[PDB]
Enzyme design. Structure first.
Site, PDB file in Angstrom:
ATOM      1  N   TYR A   1       0.863  -1.209   0.000  1.00  0.00           N
ATOM      2  CA  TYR A   1       0.000   0.000   0.000  1.00  0.00           C
ATOM      3  C   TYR A   1       0.893   1.251   0.000  1.00  0.00           C
ATOM      4  O   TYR A   1       1.105   1.862  -1.053  1.00  0.00           O
ATOM      5  CB  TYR A   1      -0.996  -0.012   1.167  1.00  0.00           C
ATOM      6  CG  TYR A   1      -2.011   1.126   1.171  1.00  0.00           C
ATOM      7  CD1 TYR A   1      -3.039   1.194   0.209  1.00  0.00           C
ATOM      8  CD2 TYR A   1      -1.954   2.121   2.155  1.00  0.00           C
ATOM      9  CE1 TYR A   1      -3.989   2.236   0.231  1.00  0.00           C
ATOM     10  CE2 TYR A   1      -2.865   3.170   2.178  1.00  0.00           C
ATOM     11  CZ  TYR A   1      -3.885   3.213   1.224  1.00  0.00           C
ATOM     12  OH  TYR A   1      -4.781   4.249   1.298  1.00  0.00           O
TER      13      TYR A   1
ATOM     14  N   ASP B   1     -17.734   3.618  -7.687  1.00  0.00           N
ATOM     15  CA  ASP B   1     -16.590   3.959  -6.873  1.00  0.00           C
ATOM     16  C   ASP B   1     -16.424   5.477  -6.826  1.00  0.00           C
ATOM     17  O   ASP B   1     -15.694   6.088  -7.659  1.00  0.00           O
ATOM     18  CB  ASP B   1     -15.303   3.272  -7.323  1.00  0.00           C
ATOM     19  CG  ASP B   1     -14.134   3.533  -6.354  1.00  0.00           C
ATOM     20  OD1 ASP B   1     -14.269   4.367  -5.412  1.00  0.00           O
ATOM     21  OD2 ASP B   1     -13.063   2.915  -6.547  1.00  0.00           O
TER      22      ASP B   1
ATOM     23  N   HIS C   1     -15.899   1.327  -3.990  1.00  0.00           N
ATOM     24  CA  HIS C   1     -14.464   1.312  -3.748  1.00  0.00           C
ATOM     25  C   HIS C   1     -14.032  -0.028  -3.161  1.00  0.00           C
ATOM     26  O   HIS C   1     -12.885  -0.454  -3.287  1.00  0.00           O
ATOM     27  CB  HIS C   1     -14.048   2.443  -2.815  1.00  0.00           C
ATOM     28  CG  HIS C   1     -12.583   2.741  -2.888  1.00  0.00           C
ATOM     29  ND1 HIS C   1     -11.946   3.031  -4.078  1.00  0.00           N
ATOM     30  CD2 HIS C   1     -11.631   2.779  -1.928  1.00  0.00           C
ATOM     31  CE1 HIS C   1     -10.665   3.247  -3.838  1.00  0.00           C
ATOM     32  NE2 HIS C   1     -10.451   3.112  -2.542  1.00  0.00           N
TER      33      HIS C   1
ATOM     34  N   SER D   1      -6.315   1.232  -4.380  1.00  0.00           N
ATOM     35  CA  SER D   1      -6.474   2.646  -4.002  1.00  0.00           C
ATOM     36  C   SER D   1      -5.115   3.299  -4.130  1.00  0.00           C
ATOM     37  O   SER D   1      -4.564   3.278  -5.200  1.00  0.00           O
ATOM     38  CB  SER D   1      -7.068   2.776  -2.589  1.00  0.00           C
ATOM     39  OG  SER D   1      -7.656   4.043  -2.369  1.00  0.00           O
TER      40      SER D   1
HETATM   41  C1  LIG Z   1      -7.349   4.615  -1.164  1.00  0.00           C
HETATM   42  O1  LIG Z   1      -5.939   4.576  -0.978  1.00  0.00           O
HETATM   43  C2  LIG Z   1      -7.953   3.827   0.033  1.00  0.00           C
HETATM   44  O2  LIG Z   1      -9.374   3.856  -0.025  1.00  0.00           O
HETATM   45  C3  LIG Z   1      -7.818   6.079  -1.356  1.00  0.00           C
HETATM   46  C4  LIG Z   1      -7.005   6.809  -2.429  1.00  0.00           C
HETATM   47  C5  LIG Z   1      -5.939   7.616  -1.697  1.00  0.00           C
HETATM   48  C6  LIG Z   1      -6.238   7.525  -0.205  1.00  0.00           C
HETATM   49  N1  LIG Z   1      -7.553   6.871  -0.156  1.00  0.00           N
HETATM   50  C7  LIG Z   1      -8.467   6.967   0.836  1.00  0.00           C
HETATM   51  O3  LIG Z   1      -9.585   6.418   0.853  1.00  0.00           O
HETATM   52  C8  LIG Z   1      -8.006   7.782   2.010  1.00  0.00           C
HETATM   53  C9  LIG Z   1      -7.060   6.903   2.834  1.00  0.00           C
HETATM   54  C10 LIG Z   1      -7.553   6.926   4.284  1.00  0.00           C
HETATM   55  C11 LIG Z   1      -8.901   7.621   4.194  1.00  0.00           C
HETATM   56  C12 LIG Z   1      -9.102   8.112   2.971  1.00  0.00           C
HETATM   57  C13 LIG Z   1     -10.251   8.950   2.601  1.00  0.00           C
HETATM   58  O4  LIG Z   1     -10.214   9.561   1.551  1.00  0.00           O
HETATM   59  N2  LIG Z   1     -11.297   9.013   3.444  1.00  0.00           N
HETATM   60  C14 LIG Z   1     -12.492   9.839   3.303  1.00  0.00           C
HETATM   61  C15 LIG Z   1     -12.248  10.937   4.314  1.00  0.00           C
HETATM   62  C16 LIG Z   1     -13.014  10.995   5.491  1.00  0.00           C
HETATM   63  C17 LIG Z   1     -12.776  11.977   6.463  1.00  0.00           C
HETATM   64  C18 LIG Z   1     -11.770  12.921   6.269  1.00  0.00           C
HETATM   65  C19 LIG Z   1     -11.000  12.859   5.100  1.00  0.00           C
HETATM   66  C20 LIG Z   1     -11.225  11.871   4.130  1.00  0.00           C
END
Ligand SMILES: *[C@](O)(CO)[C@@H]1CCCN1C(=O)[C@@H]1CCC=C1C(=O)NCc1ccccc1
EC number: 3.4.21.26
Length: 710
Positions: free
Chosen positions: A473, A641, A680, A554
């Site tokens: 990751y 997604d 997702h 992701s």
């Molecule tokens: C994936 O890596 C994993 O789902 C995607 C793409 C880059 C990061 N990411 C996310 O989903 C991030 C990683 C941890 C949480 C994420 C997110 O975007 N969460 C929604 C969110 C909720 C509250 C505050 C900020 C973001």
């Protein structure tokens, strides 16, 4: 092997954008519109060649049958108590969604409390978030359709499992916190927007608000309690202190483990909750994380990373709040990460550490921080826990690479704590003792030692002959810890594979310095680390490039896509799930703006210069050497997604097929599959999970010509 042709895909050669003097051409920009006939025709044409490719070899069917058989085992969460009753989640084996059960005592007959399976024919309506009232008598729960982040909150009275009329719309990235008077619940919602809000839109999510819903009223009557109109990216999540006296507001902007912390003493409201609360801005910056653990009057215990990359516990007295006055209750460990902390039975703390990517679990005294009890565990992960301040017992769930794992119970009213196995399930078909897990530490390009777990059949010769599946990751402070995966064990047992998980920088395995070592200017460390992991596997004789598969999802999908561009010669097969591919535009869509804390943003000249160097969409390039082609590649995405909008994979596969797929020397397939009524990944029904792993391993088997081993 390539019996199909790639679809015709229009190139808009006029799509040219200036980034700080660098002209970027984006000929597939039109795929950013999910609703156009052009984009829908593109998805249909791609699936039309991918699906027959995946389903041609008998191996997909053998894999799927074996996955269906071996994945069919009973799956439980920890028991947890709310008010007078116990609850737990349970799937008999192959149900699309796990079901929530209630019992009136630990020895009492359990009954179905909430069964999401009856809400759709295909299990694509899933629980996302829930919260019981303080007295355990009322229950709020989020439902998501087709894998979207969008939530509808509904409500039930627990006694009788009675549906209530209350429905809350436009909920996303939401807290759920009931006031202890049982009057109502905090939650977050987004203002109205043009077009769709169903998970198929790409629209940016801004101006999240904090609301309070009074039980028994229409949503239109909800009270606005916090908003940040000058700061459209701020997200304020509410929770009640354990004594019900304070609302604590944690404001986030981005994905860094930091938050502002404001509080409201509810007793100080002039007339209950009637508008914007009288917030006291205790921590009014984003310099550190402050995760509420418990309080005793005005003394608030928080898990923090302030001055402590590996995390520690501090006490902040609201009546003497300056940082020089804070007490350090449990000091930071020099290497081990304090992952999470719970308060249970009034004055115990349960602390869970990450020690070289394995969990430990310890009971501490609240007053002094002193260690009282170690709960012994095999090597693996704690993945579930229950026990809050008023509770007198704990449950915790452990898992690892080789067994589905165990749920433990410990009665904390006993003088001598003795945890006991509460539930344990064996997976007949995989004998754990035939396999081993080793942990090694390999040097990366700059000499940093990176952990890697390797799982394989006992007694194998390290002669490079084995297929390997290397997972990573590398981002967002997420630690990639041992977990039980039937699908990966079938690769080992029935495809003769070696499994590997590289704990590359960007993750949280060694605290904030590990995280910072794989972000921003240093994101390339992630790709360097992962390439070094593959080289280690090859050099040590676990595998060879032609038999090596890499996988990530992701941010992990970015990882493997980039590694394919940068070292096409190192990998035979790449599977990139739901990946961030357009690093120049990711921030424009849905919640992508929150990831700039890991990646930077292309609006900035400095960040653009980092991003352009590794953006998968912008680094597709024929390998120079005649003997080198791209690995076989499979992108997996889905039409709802809305976490990582599918345009990322759509544009990326169009580019791969045009630049690389059209070269004579390219014989390895470059394919995308776009699923329907899926998102997702969170809340994906069992049936889809089975189809997905069957697709992945059939792809691997066909591209590397691997024989099934019965
Ligand atoms: C994936 O890596 C994993 O789902 C995607 C793409 C880059 C990061 N990411 C996310 O989903 C991030 C990683 C941890 C949480 C994420 C997110 O975007 N969460 C929604 C969110 C909720 C509250 C505050 C900020 C973001």
């Amino acid at each position: 092997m390539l019996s199909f042709q790639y679809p015709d895909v229009y190139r808009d050669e006029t799509a040219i954008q200036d980034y700080h003097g660098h002209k970027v051409c984006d000929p597939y920009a039109w795929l950013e519109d999910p609703d156009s006939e052009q984009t829908k025709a593109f998805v249909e044409a791609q699936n039309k060649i991918t699906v027959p490719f995946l389903e041609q070899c008998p191996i997909r069917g053998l894999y799927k049958e074996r996955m269906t058989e071996l994945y069919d085992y009973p799956k439980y969460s920890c028991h947890f108590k709310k008010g007078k009753r116990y609850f737990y989640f349970y799937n008999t084996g192959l149900q699309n969604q796990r079901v929530l059960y209630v019992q009136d005592s630990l020895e009492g007959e359990a009954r179905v409390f909430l069964d999401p399976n009856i809400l759709s024919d295909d299990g694509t309506v899933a629980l996302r978030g829930y919260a019981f009232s303080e007295d355990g008598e009322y229950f709020a729960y989020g439902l998501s359709a087709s894998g979207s982040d969008w939530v509808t909150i509904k409500f039930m009275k627990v006694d009788g499992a009675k549906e209530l009329p209350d429905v809350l719309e436009r909920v996303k990235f939401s807290c759920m916190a009931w006031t202890h008077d049982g009057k109502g619940m905090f939650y977050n919602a987004y203002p109205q927007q043009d077009g769709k809000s169903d998970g198929t839109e790409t629209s940016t999510n801004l101006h999240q608000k904090l609301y309070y819903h009074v039980l028994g009223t229409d949503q239109s009557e909800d009270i606005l309690c916090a908003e940040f109109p000058d700061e459209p990216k701020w997200m304020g999540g509410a929770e009640l202190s354990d004594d019900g006296r304070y609302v604590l507001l944690s404001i986030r902007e981005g994905c860094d483990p930091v938050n502002r912390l404001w509080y409201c003493d509810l007793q100080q409201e002039s007339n209950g909750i009637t508008g914007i609360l009288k917030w006291v801005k205790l921590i009014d910056n984003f310099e550190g994380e402050y995760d509420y653990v418990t309080n005793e009057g005005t003394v608030f215990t928080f898990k923090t990373n302030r001055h402590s990359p590996n995390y520690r516990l501090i006490n902040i007295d609201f009546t003497d709040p300056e940082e020089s006055k804070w007490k350090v209750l449990v000091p930071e460990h020099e290497k081990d990460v304090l992952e999470w902390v719970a308060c249970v039975r009034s004055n115990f703390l349960v602390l869970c550490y990450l020690h070289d990517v394995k969990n430990t679990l310890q009971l501490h005294d609240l007053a002094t921080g002193a260690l009282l009890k170690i709960f012994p565990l095999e090597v693996g992960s704690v993945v579930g826990y229950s026990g809050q301040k008023k509770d007198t017992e704990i449950f915790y769930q452990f898992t690892s690479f080789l067994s589905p794992g165990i749920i433990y119970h410990c009665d904390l009213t006993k003088e001598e704590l003795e945890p006991r196995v509460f539930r344990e399930v064996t997976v007949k078909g995989i004998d754990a003792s035939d396999y081993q897990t080793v942990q090694i530490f390999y040097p990366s390009k700059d000499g940093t030692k990176i952990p890697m777990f390797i799982v394989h059949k006992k007694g194998i010769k390290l002669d490079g002959s084995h297929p390997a599946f290397l997972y990573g990751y590398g981002g967002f402070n997420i630690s990639i810890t041992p977990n039980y995966s039937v699908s990966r064990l079938i690769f080992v047992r029935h495809m003769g594979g070696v499994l590997a998980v590289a704990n590359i920088r960007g993750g949280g395995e060694y605290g904030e310095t590990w995280h910072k070592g794989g972000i921003l200017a240093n994101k390339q460390n992630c790709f360097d680390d992962f390439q070094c992991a593959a080289e280690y596997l090859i050099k040590e004789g676990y595998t060879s490039p032609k038999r090596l598969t890499i996988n990530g999802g992701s941010n992990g999908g970015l990882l493997v896509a980039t590694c394919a561009n940068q070292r096409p010669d190192l990998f035979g097969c790449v599977i990139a799930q739901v990946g961030v591919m357009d690093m120049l535009k990711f921030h424009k869509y849905t919640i992508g703006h929150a990831w700039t804390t890991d990646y930077g943003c292309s609006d900035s000249k400095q960040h653009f210069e980092w991003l352009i160097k590794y953006s998968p969409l912008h680094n597709v390039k024929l390998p120079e050497a005649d003997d080198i082609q791209y690995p076989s590649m499979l992108l997996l995405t889905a039409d709802h997604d809305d976490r990582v909008v599918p345009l990322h994979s759509l544009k990326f596969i169009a580019t791969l097929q045009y630049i690389v797929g059209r070269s004579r020397k390219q014989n390895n397939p470059l394919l995308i599959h776009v699923d329907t009524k899926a998102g997702h990944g969170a809340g994906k029904p069992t049936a889809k999970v089975i189809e997905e792993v069957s697709d992945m391993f059939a792809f691997i088997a066909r591209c590397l010509n691997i024989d099934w081993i019965p």
